[PDB]
Amino acid sequence: GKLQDVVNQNAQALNTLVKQLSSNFGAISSVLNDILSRLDKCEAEVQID
Amino acid sequence: SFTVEKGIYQTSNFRVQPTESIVRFPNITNLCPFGEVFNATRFASVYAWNRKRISNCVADYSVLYNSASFSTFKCYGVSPTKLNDLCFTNVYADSFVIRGDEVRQIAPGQTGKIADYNYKLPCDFTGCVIAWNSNNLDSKVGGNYNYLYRLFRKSNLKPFERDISTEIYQAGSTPCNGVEGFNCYFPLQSYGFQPTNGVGYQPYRVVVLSFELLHAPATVCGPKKSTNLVKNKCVNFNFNGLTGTGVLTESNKKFLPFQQFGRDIADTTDAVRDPQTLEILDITPCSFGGVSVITPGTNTSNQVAVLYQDVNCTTWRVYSTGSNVFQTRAGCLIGAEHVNNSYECDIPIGAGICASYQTSQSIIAYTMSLGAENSVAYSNNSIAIPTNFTISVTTEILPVSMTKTSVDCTMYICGDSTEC
Amino acid sequence: GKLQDVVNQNAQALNTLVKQLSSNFGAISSVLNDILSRLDKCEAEVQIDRLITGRLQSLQTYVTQQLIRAAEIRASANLAATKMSECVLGQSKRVDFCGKGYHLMSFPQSAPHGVVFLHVTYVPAQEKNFTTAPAICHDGKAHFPREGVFVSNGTHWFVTQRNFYEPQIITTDNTFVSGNCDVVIGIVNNTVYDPL
Amino acid sequence: AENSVAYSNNSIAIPTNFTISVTTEILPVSMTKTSVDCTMYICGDSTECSNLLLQYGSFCTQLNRALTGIAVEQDKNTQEVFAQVKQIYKTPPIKDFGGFNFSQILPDPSKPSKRSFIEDLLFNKVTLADAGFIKQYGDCLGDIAARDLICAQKFNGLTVLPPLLTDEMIAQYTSALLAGTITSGWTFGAGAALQIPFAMQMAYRFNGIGVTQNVLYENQKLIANQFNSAIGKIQDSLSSTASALGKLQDVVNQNAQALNTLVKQLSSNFGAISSVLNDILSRLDKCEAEVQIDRLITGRLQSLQTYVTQQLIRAAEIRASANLAATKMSECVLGQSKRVDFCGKGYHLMSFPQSAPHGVVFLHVTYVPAQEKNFTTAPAICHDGKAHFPREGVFVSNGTHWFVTQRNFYEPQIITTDNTFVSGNCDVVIGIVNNTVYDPL
Ligand SMILES: *[C@@H]1O[C@H](CO)[C@@H](O[C@@H]2O[C@H](CO)[C@@H](O)[C@H](O)[C@H]2NC(C)=O)[C@H](O)[C@H]1NC(C)=O
Ligand SMILES: *[C@@H]1O[C@H](CO)[C@@H](O[C@@H]2O[C@H](CO)[C@@H](O)[C@H](O)[C@H]2NC(C)=O)[C@H](O)[C@H]1NC(C)=O
Ligand SMILES: *[C@@H]1O[C@H](CO)[C@@H](O[C@@H]2O[C@H](CO)[C@@H](O)[C@H](O)[C@H]2NC(C)=O)[C@H](O)[C@H]1NC(C)=O
Ligand SMILES: *[C@@H]1O[C@H](CO)[C@@H](O[C@@H]2O[C@H](CO)[C@@H](O)[C@H](O)[C@H]2NC(C)=O)[C@H](O)[C@H]1NC(C)=O
Ligand SMILES: *[C@@H]1O[C@H](CO)[C@@H](O[C@@H]2O[C@H](CO)[C@@H](O)[C@H](O)[C@H]2NC(C)=O)[C@H](O)[C@H]1NC(C)=O
Ligand SMILES: *[C@@H]1O[C@H](CO)[C@@H](O[C@@H]2O[C@H](CO)[C@@H](O)[C@H](O)[C@H]2NC(C)=O)[C@H](O)[C@H]1NC(C)=O
Ligand SMILES: CCCCC/C=C\C/C=C/CCCCCCCC(=O)O
Ligand SMILES: *[C@@H]1O[C@H](CO)[C@@H](O)[C@H](O)[C@H]1NC(C)=O
Ligand SMILES: *[C@@H]1O[C@H](CO)[C@@H](O)[C@H](O)[C@H]1NC(C)=O
Ligand SMILES: *[C@@H]1O[C@H](CO)[C@@H](O)[C@H](O)[C@H]1NC(C)=O
Ligand SMILES: *[C@@H]1O[C@H](CO)[C@@H](O)[C@H](O)[C@H]1NC(C)=O
Ligand SMILES: *[C@@H]1O[C@H](CO)[C@@H](O)[C@H](O)[C@H]1NC(C)=O
Ligand SMILES: *[C@@H]1O[C@H](CO)[C@@H](O)[C@H](O)[C@H]1NC(C)=O
Ligand SMILES: *[C@@H]1O[C@H](CO)[C@@H](O)[C@H](O)[C@H]1NC(C)=O
Ligand SMILES: *[C@@H]1O[C@H](CO)[C@@H](O)[C@H](O)[C@H]1NC(C)=O
Ligand SMILES: *[C@@H]1O[C@H](CO)[C@@H](O)[C@H](O)[C@H]1NC(C)=O
Ligand SMILES: *[C@@H]1O[C@H](CO)[C@@H](O)[C@H](O)[C@H]1NC(C)=O
Ligand SMILES: *[C@@H]1O[C@H](CO)[C@@H](O)[C@H](O)[C@H]1NC(C)=O
């Protein structure tokens, strides 16, 4: 189990990093494409930042 | 805390406050053409909007208070309160006349006939939109039809693009072949401006001032006065609207004619071309150098020593000289008496120097001793053997664990708040 | 103080984490209730998002510091386990691993968040000078000590153990013979008693 | 290299000669101590920015607490590695060490800093970024044309603090260790320093690795010559290239790179309209400049926190290395280690410390068997129905006669009652052979 713990920890870290792409982080959406299709670069730059 | 334990503490770096303030603006005295722009007898149509360059003038804009009253005045990229303290690089006034209801369309990121087909603004637009009613001027009995707007276009305009073409618009499928008819419209239509219209159908004169700030040489300046230039002193400077604090020194840098500022890789301004005398001045922060405070306990005494790193003591950059000033290799120590003896370290200054509080009572600084200095009688035929021994019990203390901690996110971040 | 440092560090970290709830983090206030009583959810959501981001960051900073401190504590605990195995459960020949001197034994004692080892060690005390030789020539042969060293109090030559002065008369069983007595440098002349 | 080995149930290989090999192990001990001024990195010479930063005092206090802990840890690491011995022993004026030549690792009083020649080489290989700690304001003001990185660091609140122990003091500590381990051996680490001739104590060490002391006395000249040649080879190797000391240059480069990256990260907008405080304050009033300055403060605080986290991790690595260096100082300089490959390749004889920038260099003197020879062997010999086993040795034969020899050196001895011991009869043991055992009169 000591080596399986290493493997599982690495896989879990990568999967968590993938999962964390659904957060808005204060923007109006978590999707770049939705922001760019709903707003012009004018104020889309703020959300993308 | 109100009590400080014995030791050495890193305080803030040595700070120098600015002694005075200076302002350096270009040597120009003419007033900007407010009359030719705002007091113009004949404005342009929105579809063919008039762009005028403004250069080499002072933008007081308090001469407009006497007569001009502006229905809308919105500034993007700059606060209205700072316009008197800035210089503007390349200034253009775009003038035209529109309907009252269409003044809202003169803004970044707008849609409508004016925004799409006649006059388009960028969203990276630094400048001020000004609009005021002109019913008494641009409206006459029977309808003033001298002002035109484009009603039909195949595609939206690019920002600051002008389209004066009068080709027939093909709204339908069949070509028009240069003649009007069904689904074949003349693209331009005239405003019907009558003095008895509603305020949303009354003419409005619009001036859009476009400029950049604090990146290039400027010839349009605010009404600020100019102060004599002083060097080699920490000052508050205002160079062409760019404010800051620092020491101004002569420079060996050779600016190209189109450059006004120079920057680090951190984008902070190093060098500036003085707008009055065409010379390059390097700007340096006037706060520099580490400072450390050596103290015994505040319950023991209130005396402290100060170690000024990166100063030499052999007009110093120190808070107070006093006496007992001497130079170590860790910096200049002020407030500690040097002694020729060597003891075990109590407060490590650095670079082999330590300090202590000794008896009358004062802080002393010394070179720490590595230990008792001795030799050993080595020989090719002499040995040393023990005839006795001791049983010694020593103590070694080792941490094993620490406190186990759990955190409730919802309660630390959002304590007893449901919406949170 | 090594264990009090651990306790103080943990307490200080928790107290700092409590203190960091007074920061606006760019919002209009550091209090959720003030924001919610002054603004509707309409624009209160923005300020609350700012506060959430900031407090999450504070928590992440705390957890990172705790992980680093846990790594340090785990290193110390691994060392303590090694000392428990090699000095309490045995005798260590490693120098200065368990006390200063030649390690005899060790005793463990529990302490809050730690262990205290009482290392009992042997320290030579009263050294005395002697004249010495690597070997002695007896009958053209060279005699070397087995486990000891040749010493002399000026007149007679004895063989003694190394960490304690216990002189013994030179004897065939004390020494061993290898080769003649000219190649070795520093060799001296003495007799070797042969037991009957 | 791919090879085999001639294994057999009755064949042994024993060395008839040896070599004295001096190897080099380089270990980091400390790294650069760094202090950060938050108000000056984040809010350089801006008062309104400082007033806005005032509410992040807890964050900046914990940053500086972590960095102060790192600095104290570095000082402690150096203290544990180098200040193990409490007394400063001196080298004797006479260097009658039985033919051994330590002139190239002992200090000389010609140069000011009493460093050995090898220490001087180690100093010269690795190049320090700071090259001092006094960089006056006038100097940084005078070289604005030059893009000096230290001045750029110090103008943004990033200072490097000096180590407590200078290179002279660390060199003095190493000199004391050399004097103690040459004139006294391992006795000065276990208590009072007891003098002993160097040859007799290298023979003690030879006994420690399982070789009889008579070998050393019979080959003293050869051993001394081999040691001197190995020291000379180390000297030439150090004088040739600088890539050997890359482990310490990595520490120096990592610290410098971290500080320079932290300086470079001041050009980020962090969502504000500019990365410059002065541009924001000259273009907007405090009204909405406070928002942009808050964004910049948050971002720069985050950059500082990232720097401090990386520094804490690097400090943990350096502390592990320094603990290893202290263990090696205790177990190989202050004693003889029986742990395999802990101090050099081969059977460890002794070790010498040398100071290096931010580190230590151990010259491990080891015993390496050189010239192996094949022999036929037996676990035991049957003499009169009894079984004889060697006490500390092995039975060998050159084809005709049977001898008993020590294990790490071919020193055959005639079989004798004192060489062997008897236990049981000579049928249960397998591989036992027949031979006579001489009984002395
Ligand atoms: C700028 O000029 C080009 C060329 O006249 C325009 O692109 C054409 O638009 C018409 C619309 O029906 C198309 O039929 C052409 O095929 C296009 N040609 C090319 C090369 O793109 C373009 O619309 C104009 N852009 C603006 C803002 O006026
Ligand atoms: C070795 O040292 C011990 C003490 O460290 C000596 O024991 C002491 O001897 C004196 C004189 O007889 C007494 O007054 C003390 O009471 C003894 N102390 C203890 C703890 O026993 C001992 O005599 C020394 N032995 C030799 C051979 O020198
Ligand atoms: C130790 O004993 C041997 C033998 O008695 C000494 O060797 C003799 O030395 C003298 C003068 O050097 C010679 O005349 C003899 O021929 C030597 N005899 C033999 C058998 O070698 C030796 O000199 C003595 N060494 C010391 C330091 O006393
Ligand atoms: C053991 O090896 C050493 C060298 O590693 C041998 O010493 C060399 O012997 C040759 C021939 O006499 C000389 O040319 C060299 O000058 C010697 N080198 C050194 C450093 O001394 C030694 O002879 C070997 N001993 C045995 C028994 O084989
Ligand atoms: C030990 O080795 C050195 C050479 O590595 C011998 O030569 C001395 O080298 C140093 C510095 O290179 C000089 O200061 C000396 O002048 C050199 N000595 C001579 C006689 O030339 C040194 O002699 C050797 N030590 C002994 C005792 O032989
Ligand atoms: C080693 O010596 C013993 C005794 O001489 C040998 O044992 C004898 O072996 C022969 C043949 O196996 C028998 O006839 C004798 O009766 C044995 N005598 C005793 C006392 O046991 C033994 O064979 C020899 N082994 C080797 C390999 O030579
Ligand atoms: C009654 C049917 C409406 C259905 C449309 C639904 C979604 C699209 C929203 C479109 C914008 C509304 C018309 C505004 C016209 C521009 C006014 C201007 O010149 O500035
Ligand atoms: C006035 O303007 C000129 C540049 O045309 C410049 O040479 C001069 O220095 C300015 N006057 C002063 C007092 O700087
Ligand atoms: C603009 O016109 C009015 C009247 O014609 C006049 O009073 C005013 O001074 C003029 N303003 C400017 C800036 O010329
Ligand atoms: C400070 O000094 C006083 C003695 O006047 C003593 O009572 C007190 O315990 C000390 N406090 C600390 C923290 O040292
Ligand atoms: C400046 O400090 C250094 C030591 O840090 C010293 O050598 C030098 O003399 C000092 N400068 C002067 C003019 O004394
Ligand atoms: C210390 O020693 C120096 C010379 O070695 C001497 O000049 C100085 O007066 C001494 N100072 C004190 C306080 O003894
Ligand atoms: C041994 O000899 C040296 C010098 O001859 C002397 O300093 C030392 O004190 C002697 N040792 C003892 C225990 O007296
Ligand atoms: C040396 O020890 C022996 C035996 O105790 C004794 O006979 C002799 O007198 C001693 N000599 C000296 C100089 O102490
Ligand atoms: C030991 O040293 C002394 C003086 O240094 C010398 O006279 C003597 O010859 C040396 N003896 C040996 C065996 O080296
Ligand atoms: C010992 O025997 C093997 C094979 O019999 C041979 O390869 C090897 O070279 C021999 N060892 C030596 C030192 O010759
Ligand atoms: C083995 O060693 C002995 C003693 O040196 C010698 O008499 C004998 O000839 C040697 N035999 C062989 C095969 O080397
Ligand atoms: C050793 O090996 C050889 C061949 O593998 C075999 O003939 C012999 O019997 C073996 N001897 C012993 C004691 O195992």
Q: How near does any CA of chain C get to the CA of B231, in Å?
A: 38
Q: Give the 3-state secondary structure percentages of chain B, helix then strand then coil, rounded to 5.
A: 10, 35, 60
Alpha-carbon torsion angle D75, D80, D82, D83, nearest 10: 100
Instruction: Please state the atom number of ligand 18 nearest to the C-alpha of residue D431.
Output: 13
In single-letter form, the type of residue at position C147 comes to E
Nearest to D106 by CA among D97, D115, D98: D115
Structure tokens at B197: 């219209």
- Of B402, B405, B412, B416, which to mutate for an interface test with C (greatest number of C Cβ within 10 Å)? B402
CA atoms within 13 A on the CB side of C155: 0
Decide whether any atom of ligand 15 lies within 6 Å of the C140 Cβ: no
The partner residue sitting opposite C144, judged by closest CB among D214, D220, D320, is D214
| Ligand 18 centroid, distance to B270 Cα (angstroms) | 87
CA atoms within 13 A on the CB side of D299: 20
Nearest to D202 by CA among D191, D193, D215, D190: D215
Decide whether any atom of ligand 15 lies within 6 Å of the B380 Cβ: yes
Continuous segment of H or E residues that includes residue B281: strand B280-284
The set of protein residues with a Cβ atom below 6 angstroms from ligand 6 is D 382, 434
Lookup result for tokens 């400090």: D315
Main-chain dihedrals φ then ψ at residue D311, nearest 5 degrees:
-65, -40
What whole-number distance in Å separates Cα of residue D295 and Cα of residue D276? Answer: 12
In single-letter form, the type of residue at position C175 comes to T
| Ligand 8 centroid, distance to B276 Cα (angstroms) | 5
Q: How near does any CA of chain D get to the CA of A42, in Å?
A: 13
Decide if B109 touches A, using CB distance below 8 A: yes
| Ligand 18 centroid, distance to D9 Cα (angstroms) | 6
Using CA atoms, how far residue B410 sits from A26, B413, B419, D311, in Å, is: 18, 6, 11, 31
What whole-number distance in Å separates Cα of residue C5 and Cα of residue A21? Answer: 39
CA atoms within 13 A on the CB side of D255: 24
Nearest to D323 by CA among D84, D147, D143, D85: D84
Resolution (A): 2.8
Contacts of A49 in chain D (CB under 8 A): 269, 271
| Ligand 14 centroid, distance to C155 Cα (angstroms) | 6
Nearest to B420 by CA among C89, C51, D129: C51
Using CA atoms, how far residue B212 sits from A23, B76, B90, B206, D401, in Å, is: 36, 11, 7, 20, 104
- Kindly report the length of chain B: 420
Answer whether B156's CB lies under 8 Å from B111's CB: no
| Ligand 3 centroid, distance to C149 Cα (angstroms) | 23
Instruction: Please state the atom number of ligand 18 nearest to the C-alpha of residue D430.
Output: 13
Contacts of B20 (CB under 8 A, 6+ apart): B230, B233, B235, B236
For C13-79, what is the HEC assignment? HHHHHHHHHHCCCCCCCCCHHHHHHHCCHHHHHHHHHHHHHHHHHHHHHHHHHHHHHHHHHHHHHHH
Contacts of B109 in chain A (CB under 8 A): 40, 42-43
Q: What is the DSSP letter of D438?
A: B
| Ligand 1 centroid, distance to B165 Cα (angstroms) | 14
- For D5-21, letters b (16+ CB in 10 Å) and e give eeeeeeebebbeebbbb
In single-letter form, the type of residue at position D441 comes to L
Decide whether any atom of ligand 3 lies within 6 Å of the C137 Cβ: yes
Q: How near does any CA of chain B get to the CA of D39, in Å?
A: 8
Contacts of D271 in chain A (CB under 8 A): 46, 49
Contact B108 A41 (CB under 8 A): no
Using CA atoms, how far residue A33 sits from A16, A37, A38, C157, D85, in Å, is: 22, 6, 8, 97, 67
* DSSP string across D322-374: HHHHHHHIIIIISS---STTSSSSSEEEEEEEEEETTEEEEEEEEEEE--EEE
Alpha-carbon torsion angle D422, D426, D431, D437, nearest 10: 50
- For C45-56, letters b (16+ CB in 10 Å) and e give eebbbbbbbbbe
Instruction: Please state the atom number of ligand 3 nearest to the C-alpha of residue C182.
Output: 21
Contacts of A46 in chain D (CB under 8 A): 271
Answer whether D194's CB lies under 8 Å from D187's CB: yes
- Of A39, A42, A43, which to mutate for an interface test with B (greatest number of B Cβ within 10 Å)? A42
Q: How near does any CA of chain B get to the CA of A35, in Å?
A: 15
From the CA of C154, which ligand is nearest?
14
Nearest to D338 by CA among B362, B266, C93, C49: C93
| Ligand 11 centroid, distance to B351 Cα (angstroms) | 15
Contacts of D56 in chain C (CB under 8 A): 23
* DSSP string across B257-268: TT--EEE-TT--
In single-letter form, the type of residue at position D409 comes to F
* DSSP string across B166-235: -PPEE-SSS--TT--BTTEE-SEEE--B-TTS-GGGSEEEEEEEE--BSSS--SEE-S---PPP--SSEE
C136-137 sheet: strands from edge to edge: C175-180, C141-145, C136-137, C188-189
What whole-number distance in Å separates Cα of residue D107 and Cα of residue D117? Answer: 7
Using CA atoms, how far residue D57 sits from B6, D41, D156, D310, in Å, is: 22, 14, 18, 21
Instruction: Give the neighbours of chain D: at least 3 Cβ pairs within 8 Å.
Output: A, B, C
**Cβ within 8 Å of C, A 1-49:** 24-26
What whole-number distance in Å separates Cα of residue D210 and Cα of residue D393? Answer: 10
Structure tokens at B102: 């269409």
Using CA atoms, how far residue B170 sits from B163, B178, B187, in Å, is: 17, 10, 10
What whole-number distance in Å separates Cα of residue D209 and Cα of residue D205? Answer: 6
* Number of other CB atoms surrounding residue B250 within 10 Å: 11
Answer whether D290's CB lies under 8 Å from C45's CB: no
The set of protein residues with a Cβ atom below 6 angstroms from ligand 13 is B 377; C 127-129
| Structure determination technique employed | cryo-EM
| Ligand 14 centroid, distance to C152 Cα (angstroms) | 9
- DSSP lists the bridge partners of residue D366 as D21, D348
What whole-number distance in Å separates Cα of residue D303 and Cα of residue D267? Answer: 12
What whole-number distance in Å separates Cα of residue D237 and Cα of residue D228? Answer: 14
Instruction: Please state the atom number of ligand 11 nearest to the C-alpha of residue D134.
Output: 5
**Cβ within 8 Å of C, B 361-420:** 377, 380-403, 405, 407, 409, 412-415, 417, 419-420
From the CA of B329, which ligand is nearest?
11
Answer whether D12's CB lies under 8 Å from D394's CB: yes
Structure tokens at D147: 């893009």
What whole-number distance in Å separates Cα of residue D225 and Cα of residue D20? Answer: 9
Lookup result for tokens 């949170």: B420
What whole-number distance in Å separates Cα of residue B305 and Cα of residue B365? Answer: 10
Answer whether C26's CB lies under 8 Å from D291's CB: yes
Nearest to B57 by CA among B216, B219, B237, B211: B219
Using CA atoms, how far residue D303 sits from B83, C67, D34, D57, in Å, is: 34, 20, 15, 16
What whole-number distance in Å separates Cα of residue D38 and Cα of residue D56? Answer: 10
Nearest CA, atom 1, ligand 18: D9
From the CA of B4, which ligand is nearest?
10
Q: What is the DSSP letter of B352?
A: T
| Ligand 4 centroid, distance to D100 Cα (angstroms) | 18
Contact C46 A25 (CB under 8 A): no
Nearest to D411 by CA among B302, B88, C179, B42: C179
Decide if C166 touches A, using CB distance below 8 A: no
What whole-number distance in Å separates Cα of residue D171 and Cα of residue D183? Answer: 18
At B285 the three-state DSSP class reads coil
**Ligand 18, pocket-test mutation among D7, D8, D10, D382, most atoms within 8 A of CB:** D10
The partner residue sitting opposite C126, judged by closest CB among B381, B388, B414, is B388
Decide whether any atom of ligand 15 lies within 6 Å of the B382 Cβ: no
What whole-number distance in Å separates Cα of residue B244 and Cα of residue B235? Answer: 8
Using CA atoms, how far residue B65 sits from B10, B62, D313, in Å, is: 55, 5, 63
Decide whether any atom of ligand 16 lies within 6 Å of the D370 Cβ: no
Compute the count of residue pairs across chains A and B with CB atoms less than 8 Å apart: 8
Contact D411 C178 (CB under 8 A): yes
Contacts of C95 in chain D (CB under 8 A): 186, 189-190, 330-331, 334-335
